[PDB]
Design a protein around this nucleic acid. Structure first.
Ligand code: K
Ligand code: MG
Ligand code: MG
Ligand code: MG
Ligand code: MG
Ligand code: MG
Ligand code: MG
Ligand code: MG
Ligand code: MG
Ligand code: MG
Ligand code: MG
Ligand code: MG
Ligand code: MG
Ligand code: MG
Ligand code: MG
Ligand code: MG
Ligand code: MG
Ligand code: MG
Ligand code: MG
Ligand code: MG
Ligand code: MG
Ligand code: MG
Ligand code: MG
Ligand code: MG
Ligand code: MG
Ligand code: MG
Ligand code: MG
Ligand code: MG
Ligand code: MG
Ligand code: MG
Ligand code: MG
Ligand code: MG
Ligand code: MG
Ligand code: MG
Ligand code: MG
Ligand code: MG
Ligand code: MG
Ligand code: MG
Ligand code: MG
Ligand code: MG
Ligand code: MG
Ligand code: MG
Ligand code: MG
Ligand code: MG
Ligand code: MG
Ligand code: MG
Ligand code: MG
Ligand code: MG
Ligand code: MG
Ligand code: MG
Ligand code: MG
Ligand code: MG
Ligand code: MG
Ligand code: MG
Ligand code: MG
Ligand code: MG
Ligand code: MG
Ligand code: MG
Ligand code: MG
Ligand code: MG
Ligand code: MG
Ligand code: MG
Ligand code: MG
Ligand code: MG
Ligand code: MG
Ligand code: MG
Ligand code: MG
Ligand code: MG
Ligand code: MG
Ligand code: MG
Ligand code: MG
Ligand code: MG
Ligand code: MG
Ligand code: MG
Ligand code: MG
Ligand code: MG
Ligand code: MG
Ligand code: MG
Ligand code: MG
Ligand code: MG
Ligand code: MG
Ligand code: MG
Ligand code: MG
Ligand code: MG
Ligand code: MG
Ligand code: MG
Ligand code: MG
Ligand code: MG
Ligand code: MG
Ligand code: MG
Ligand code: MG
Ligand code: MG
Ligand code: MG
Ligand code: MG
Ligand code: MG
Ligand code: MG
Ligand code: MG
Ligand code: MG
Ligand code: MG
Ligand code: MG
Ligand code: MG
Ligand code: MG
Ligand code: MG
Ligand code: MG
Ligand code: MG
Ligand code: MG
Ligand code: MG
Ligand code: MG
Ligand code: MG
Ligand code: MG
Ligand code: MG
Ligand code: MG
Ligand code: MG
Ligand code: MG
Ligand code: MG
Ligand code: MG
Ligand code: MG
Ligand code: MG
Ligand code: MG
Ligand code: MG
Ligand code: MG
Ligand code: MG
Ligand code: MG
Ligand code: MG
Ligand code: MG
Ligand code: MG
Ligand code: MG
Ligand code: MG
Lengths: 75, 66, 136, 116, 177, 51
RNA sequence: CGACUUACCAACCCGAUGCAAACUGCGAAUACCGGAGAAUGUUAUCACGGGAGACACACGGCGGGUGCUAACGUCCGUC
RNA sequence: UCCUCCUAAAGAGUAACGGAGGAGCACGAAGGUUGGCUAAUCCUGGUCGGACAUCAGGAGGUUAGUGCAAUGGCAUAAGCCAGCUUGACUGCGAGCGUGACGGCGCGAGCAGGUGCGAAAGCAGGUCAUAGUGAUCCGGUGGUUCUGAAUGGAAGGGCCAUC
RNA sequence: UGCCUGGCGGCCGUAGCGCGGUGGUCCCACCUGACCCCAUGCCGAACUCAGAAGUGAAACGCCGUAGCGCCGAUGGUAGUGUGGGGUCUCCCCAUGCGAGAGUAGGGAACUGCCAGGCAA
RNA sequence: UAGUCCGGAUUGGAGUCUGCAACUCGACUCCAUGAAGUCGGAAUCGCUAGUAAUCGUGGAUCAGAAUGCCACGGUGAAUAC
RNA sequence: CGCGGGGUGGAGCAGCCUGGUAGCUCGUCGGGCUCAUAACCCGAAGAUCGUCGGUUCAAAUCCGGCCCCCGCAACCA
RNA sequence: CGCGGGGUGGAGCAGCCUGGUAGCUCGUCGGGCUCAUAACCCGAAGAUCGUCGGUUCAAAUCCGGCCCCCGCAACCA
């Protein structure tokens, strides 16, 4: 053949889901671009990884002018 | 405007041979001397004299005259 | 022989020809050849059935071809073992679900439009039927 | 349009400031008049507001739209803000280059006592 | 400032009667005069553009911007961010001073000037002249320049149509065909 | 290949150093960044040097 | 250099149709993650230690790659 | 060996000599940060100037751009200019993700000491995911460690790095 | 209390366009000047400063009009978990879930908190 | 010491004579026009003194139409081992 | 069918695997030389690079398909 | 890993250890030559030392780097 190569899989996706209790530091979403965005008490690292900045329950929202998905935390 | 970088934009007197004296401001020096202006240029007469040039039948009649 | 003029990808998966068709209504022309059966029409079959209609109705009338291939079919050479790559694209097919209007005619009599579609249907693999442009 | 270009030029500050959850001092400048208002960290309700459009301040000044007028508002807002109990705030320049009237307003707000 | 005051004192009036304008702001006013000089031959000789800038800086008051090439193209052998021409975007006070000097004493020195094109409008009142030589302006000394590199003048206005924008210029005794 | 590696050495202090890459052909002059020396515990002018 | 004729060939928008594993302005059933609560189950769970075997699988049904929608073929997912 | 897309059955993962493409670097500014900007393709008009340089307008609305493939992303722009600079910083690290493991990744906050901004703040390399190899054995500089009787030293160790 | 207009959020297109009409006492915008503060990689177009002669022309508001965009049922259709059956590269019963598209239509948004002016 | 006050081609216009007649197709004149050309590649020609070179001049044919032909005289060389 | 290498004025060769440049030798056309032809001398033209597509600011030169062309391999039973 | 030599017109050379004066040979255009061609002969057109830095009256030259050019023989993750 001419081809037959492939990269190792990156285990990207929503790790902790909506309504799930998480501890401060817990990664919520591993993903490439900002498919989800950082809302209240959530960070956004160099890898665009959304992580909890405070102990609470995860909350997914669909808010903004352009109608983007935001991840917030509420204690 | 930004000072230093630009050239010296000084006032000067334009005076053509027609008689139209006219102060202006430009990068020249001391004085000016012009040939023509917006007044005294042949465009209002120019178009009258330029368009009415053709005429072949009368040119023949001027030679024969009969 | 009908074929896409350039394509994104040379080779395509096999897939599965399931469900019902979408081009069911006789849209442009008066009459039409509807596919009762399920299957796939090669580029050769379409041209062969087009020639059989066109030559039956003569110069007069107008024909539409609602189906177009755009699905390449690979085939492995003779006396070649399995694997060592996907085979080479030989021919092109159009997947035909039940209900799909294949051809449509216009500007001909009803009795002589049928006789033409029989000759076309004879070339095709799929079981077909005659349909008229109804209202709504 | 100019306005729209000023809004999106400001937006980055606003959105960064609402994420922190801080009490912002918005300052809307205008050819005639200069406005200022302290807004609660939620963003909706206003706690303190002052401007040269207010006759209480307009009656005193020479002209409503200059550095000395901006200082008079900048003093006023901060003078109310301390009575309400506000002290630690942020300063939303609101798409206006921090230089003239808004700088005078901010400096007057600092010198009045509003610690930010 | 002479043509500037002429606009306000006269012309402001003359145009009101033609198109029965509701307000004084409806009348077209002249916004900016943009002198361009796409020298182009600066690919070979780098100084040749510095000579053109010296000529634009003479013709206008202010010093020109050296315009970079927007995109790379093979047809002329140029690349992204290469200095290819000069421009001056003069407006306000010196604009009216230049606009007088253009029509009153520069146009008349155009070689065999018979009439300027009245059909040279953009469909939105913005006029565009193109002068062949530099010598037509009296700011350039004769034994200084050694190349006939023309510029092009572009008068930008607030009019919404070329017919509406023609009267504006025509009202300044602008020589049309 | 091409882009070699260098040793940014501290001026004022102990022989602590950083290491970075550098293109030597395009940039023939030497670096002079102002990085943190942790032995002195201070920001110091770190000059370029070879390994 | 002034310009007429024309058995004539297909643009980008219009309206009407199709098609797509590597197209998506939409979009299920399921499956998966978390919490709440009954009841049921020989703790079924997870944790640490002692011993292993095993790491040639087969076919059948569903989703598929491959082959010819060939093979008691081949390769995966799932029972 | 590594990265991207599909195959992959809407969590993760998932094979074949299945289908298509890439990588083995680049960069002292192409990093940091404050201040500004906003794109392709046209249609017009315009000195040479043409099918295409530069200017002016309009219509467009991201059709572009992103150091390099693809996918996901980007207007608050992560795109494009600009001014100061060295956070491409040392010691840590709550907690998570991903690994059979060796490993790999993300990370608020803390201590020290810095840039930038008026500050709010931001900054522990670059839109993200490729740019890479374990140990052993040596080399180089350092060091509050060892120092085969005792002082040293060699050789070790520990740091940093090849 | 209403009528106005600003600032600032909630909501993100039933919230946007095209179209037609309008507002200028304030408010807002163009505007007026540029010794200055500061500004253009040229230009007071920007940004900035000082002002009040004009104006509501453009902008922005604001009210109208379905030319578009958008929202959008019901019934059906397609898929489909579970269990069964076929004529078994396809489908069909039983039972649950049930779109997309397209119709009937809805539609010129709706509200918070200060702040100023105007008929009360 | 310049494509020049060098060259004077080429063209537009206005004419003059001859001649039945000047557009194909004459000559000359005036006005404007102002080209190639900066001493010529391989080659190559004539010329041994009033000759070569160079300046004008006339005639024949001829209504008109020479830069040709045939004649005439001005200045007048170099070189021939 | 696998595997390298090719395809450039009329001929044979460079330039091609390091992207912007088209040379060399004959032949051809024009003029010389000769009584003439050859030889010889002096000028001149002549190839968008197999073809169709990409990538790119730009392709003879990079990459892909397809049409000829050489060289190599198609073995154990 | 090194100590060493070596670095000029387009290129192959020397000259470079013994600081004040960069040669020499192929590429170079005009001659003279001959009814002519080849030769042969004569003169012309080009580097202030790859390049940057210290001292001293004078620095390719004395001394340090770079870009490198290597001769080699060593080279055991
Ligand atoms: K598995
Ligand atoms: Mg694989
Ligand atoms: Mg992958
Ligand atoms: Mg894999
Ligand atoms: Mg592996
Ligand atoms: Mg970070
Ligand atoms: Mg499939
Ligand atoms: Mg279908
Ligand atoms: Mg349909
Ligand atoms: Mg094979
Ligand atoms: Mg910013
Ligand atoms: Mg008031
Ligand atoms: Mg310091
Ligand atoms: Mg057609
Ligand atoms: Mg349509
Ligand atoms: Mg897919
Ligand atoms: Mg799909
Ligand atoms: Mg739709
Ligand atoms: Mg969606
Ligand atoms: Mg649902
Ligand atoms: Mg369920
Ligand atoms: Mg559960
Ligand atoms: Mg649980
Ligand atoms: Mg539970
Ligand atoms: Mg529970
Ligand atoms: Mg309970
Ligand atoms: Mg228990
Ligand atoms: Mg447990
Ligand atoms: Mg367990
Ligand atoms: Mg055990
Ligand atoms: Mg095994
Ligand atoms: Mg196995
Ligand atoms: Mg076994
Ligand atoms: Mg198996
Ligand atoms: Mg089986
Ligand atoms: Mg199956
Ligand atoms: Mg099978
Ligand atoms: Mg059996
Ligand atoms: Mg099997
Ligand atoms: Mg998948
Ligand atoms: Mg998956
Ligand atoms: Mg799944
Ligand atoms: Mg497996
Ligand atoms: Mg590869
Ligand atoms: Mg690197
Ligand atoms: Mg910079
Ligand atoms: Mg940054
Ligand atoms: Mg528009
Ligand atoms: Mg793009
Ligand atoms: Mg791409
Ligand atoms: Mg950046
Ligand atoms: Mg950016
Ligand atoms: Mg500083
Ligand atoms: Mg510095
Ligand atoms: Mg500095
Ligand atoms: Mg680094
Ligand atoms: Mg990384
Ligand atoms: Mg301390
Ligand atoms: Mg600290
Ligand atoms: Mg500082
Ligand atoms: Mg500071
Ligand atoms: Mg701070
Ligand atoms: Mg950052
Ligand atoms: Mg970057
Ligand atoms: Mg990147
Ligand atoms: Mg990467
Ligand atoms: Mg080993
Ligand atoms: Mg060791
Ligand atoms: Mg040693
Ligand atoms: Mg020591
Ligand atoms: Mg210690
Ligand atoms: Mg000791
Ligand atoms: Mg000791
Ligand atoms: Mg010791
Ligand atoms: Mg002992
Ligand atoms: Mg002792
Ligand atoms: Mg001892
Ligand atoms: Mg002792
Ligand atoms: Mg030691
Ligand atoms: Mg050691
Ligand atoms: Mg230790
Ligand atoms: Mg609105
Ligand atoms: Mg309107
Ligand atoms: Mg209107
Ligand atoms: Mg009105
Ligand atoms: Mg009106
Ligand atoms: Mg008032
Ligand atoms: Mg102005
Ligand atoms: Mg202004
Ligand atoms: Mg209006
Ligand atoms: Mg209007
Ligand atoms: Mg209303
Ligand atoms: Mg209505
Ligand atoms: Mg209606
Ligand atoms: Mg109605
Ligand atoms: Mg209902
Ligand atoms: Mg079943
Ligand atoms: Mg079933
Ligand atoms: Mg049953
Ligand atoms: Mg039965
Ligand atoms: Mg059966
Ligand atoms: Mg329904
Ligand atoms: Mg629906
Ligand atoms: Mg719908
Ligand atoms: Mg309808
Ligand atoms: Mg209706
Ligand atoms: Mg409304
Ligand atoms: Mg209402
Ligand atoms: Mg209230
Ligand atoms: Mg001279
Ligand atoms: Mg000439
Ligand atoms: Mg002359
Ligand atoms: Mg010439
Ligand atoms: Mg010449
Ligand atoms: Mg001569
Ligand atoms: Mg000769
Ligand atoms: Mg003579
Ligand atoms: Mg004579
Ligand atoms: Mg005679
Ligand atoms: Mg003669
Ligand atoms: Mg050649
Ligand atoms: Mg010949
Ligand atoms: Mg050929
Ligand atoms: Mg491209
Ligand atoms: Mg080429
Ligand atoms: Mg030796
Ligand atoms: Mg002779
Ligand atoms: Mg080794």
């Amino acid at each position: 053949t001419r081809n037959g190569r492939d990269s190792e899989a990156k285990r990207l996706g929503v790790k902790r889901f909506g309504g799930e209790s998480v501890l401060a530091g817990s990664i919520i979403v591993r993903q490439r671009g900002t498919k989800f965005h950082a809302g209240a008490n959530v960070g956004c690292g160099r890898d665009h990884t959304l992580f909890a900045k405070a102990d609470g329950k995860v909350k997914f929202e669909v808010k903004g002018p352009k109608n983007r998905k935001f991840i917030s935390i509420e204690a | 405007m930004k000072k230093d970088i630009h050239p010296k934009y000084e006032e000067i007197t334009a005076s053509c041979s027609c008689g139209n004296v006219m102060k202006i401001r430009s990068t020249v020096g001391h004085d000016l001397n012009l040939d023509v202006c917006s007044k005294c240029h042949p465009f209002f007469t120019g178009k009258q004299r330029d368009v009415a040039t053709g005429g072949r039948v009368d040119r023949f009649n001027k030679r024969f005259n009969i | 022989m009908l074929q896409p003029k350039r394509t994104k990808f040379r080779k395509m998966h096999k897939g599965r020809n399931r469900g019902l068709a979408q081009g069911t209504d006789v849209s442009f022309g008066s009459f039409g050849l509807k596919a009762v059966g399920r299957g796939r029409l090669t580029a050769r079959q379409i041209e062969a059935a087009r020639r059989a209609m066109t030559r039956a109705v003569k110069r007069q009338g107008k024909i539409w071809i609602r189906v177009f291939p755009d699905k390449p079919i690979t085939e492995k050479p003779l006396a070649v073992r399995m694997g060592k790559g996907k085979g080479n694209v030989e021919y092109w097919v159009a997947l035909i679900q039940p209900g799909k209007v294949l051809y449509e005619m216009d500007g001909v009599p009803e009795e002589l439009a049928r006789e033409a579609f029989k000759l076309a249907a004879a070339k095709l693999p799929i079981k077909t039927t005659f349909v008229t442009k109804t209202v709504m | 349009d100019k306005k729209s270009a000023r809004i999106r030029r400001a937006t980055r500050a606003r959105r960064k400031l609402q994420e922190l959850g801080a009490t912002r001092l918005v300052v809307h400048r205008t050819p005639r008049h200069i406005y200022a208002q302290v807004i609660a960290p939620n963003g909706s309700e206003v706690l303190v507001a002052a401007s040269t459009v207010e006759k209480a301040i307009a009656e005193q000044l020479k002209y409503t739209g200059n550095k000395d007028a901006a200082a008079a508002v900048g003093k006023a807002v901060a003078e109310r803000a301390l009575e309400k109990g506000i002290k630690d705030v942020s300063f939303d320049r609101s798409g206006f280059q921090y230089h003239g009237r808004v700088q005078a307003l901010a400096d007057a707000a600092r010198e009045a006592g509003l610690q930010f | 400032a002479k043509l500037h005051d002429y606009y306000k004192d006269e012309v402001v009036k003359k145009l009101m009667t033609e198109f029965n304008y509701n307000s004084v702001m409806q009348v077209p006013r002249v916004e900016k005069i943009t002198l361009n000089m796409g020298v182009g031959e600066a690919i070979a000789d780098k100084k040749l553009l510095d000579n053109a800038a010296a000529d634009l800086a003479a013709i206008s008051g202010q010093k020109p911007l050296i315009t970079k090439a927007r995109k790379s193209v093979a047809g002329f052998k140029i690349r992204q961010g290469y200095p290819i021409g000069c421009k001056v975007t003069l407006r306000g006070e010196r604009m009216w001073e230049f606009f007088e000097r253009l029509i009153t004493i520069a146009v008349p020195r155009i070689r065999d000037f018979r009439g300027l094109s009245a059909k040279s409008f953009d469909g939105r009142g913005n006029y565009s002249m193109g002068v062949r030589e530099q010598i037509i302006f009296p700011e350039i000394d004769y034994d200084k320049v050694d190349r006939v590199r023309g510029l092009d003048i572009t008068i930008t206005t607030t009019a919404k149509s070329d017919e509406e924008g023609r009267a504006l210029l025509a009202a300044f005794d602008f020589p049309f065909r | 290949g091409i882009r070699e590696k260098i040793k940014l050495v501290s001026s004022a202090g102990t022989g602590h150093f950083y290491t970075t890459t550098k293109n030597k052909r395009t940039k023939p002059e030497k670096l002079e960044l102002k990085k943190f020396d942790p032995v002195v515990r201070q920001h110091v002018i770190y000059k370029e040097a070879k390994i």
